[PDB]
């Protein structure tokens, strides 16, 4: 498997579902100076999808993407 299509595809899929499908569900579930949300990560995205969400759904995509590459690499392996 080519790493670019697999990792890009999985990342694209997980960003889409996080923005169009489960964004509403996550927001409903989601809803001394080192413990306060001092910086509000404001975004111009119409649906409220901000950088923190991008890191989260993007991280899942990368993790799932490498799992596909790792599992496939085993097939045809020697001494393993």
């Amino acid at each position: 498997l080519d790493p670019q299509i697999v990792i890009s595809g999985s990342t694209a899929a997980f960003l889409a579902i996080g923005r169009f499908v489960f964004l509403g569900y996550q927001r409903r579930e989601a809803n001394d100076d080192l413990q306060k949300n001092s910086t509000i990560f404001a975004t111009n995205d119409p649906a409220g999808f901000n950088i923190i969400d991008v890191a989260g759904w993007g991280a899942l995509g990368h993790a799932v993407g490498f799992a596909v590459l790792a599992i496939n690499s085993l097939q045809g392996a020697n001494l393993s």
Partner: protein, 74 residues
Amino acid sequence: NFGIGHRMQAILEAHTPPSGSLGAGHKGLFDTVNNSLHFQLGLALASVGTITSLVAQHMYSLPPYAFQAIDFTT
């Protein structure tokens, strides 16, 4: 501080069996555990105490160190 993830108090308040078999369930236990150093130390000792036994049971049967098995006294 980043607006994602779980609040531990929320998780505990949610886990109440509907039939009432556990009464109020886990309501109030976040403050009980979080405000009691003895509740925390009791949990830590119980967890580490069991882990120490696991170390004993697994290290003799699955020796991780080279030439450990033949050193009977060790």
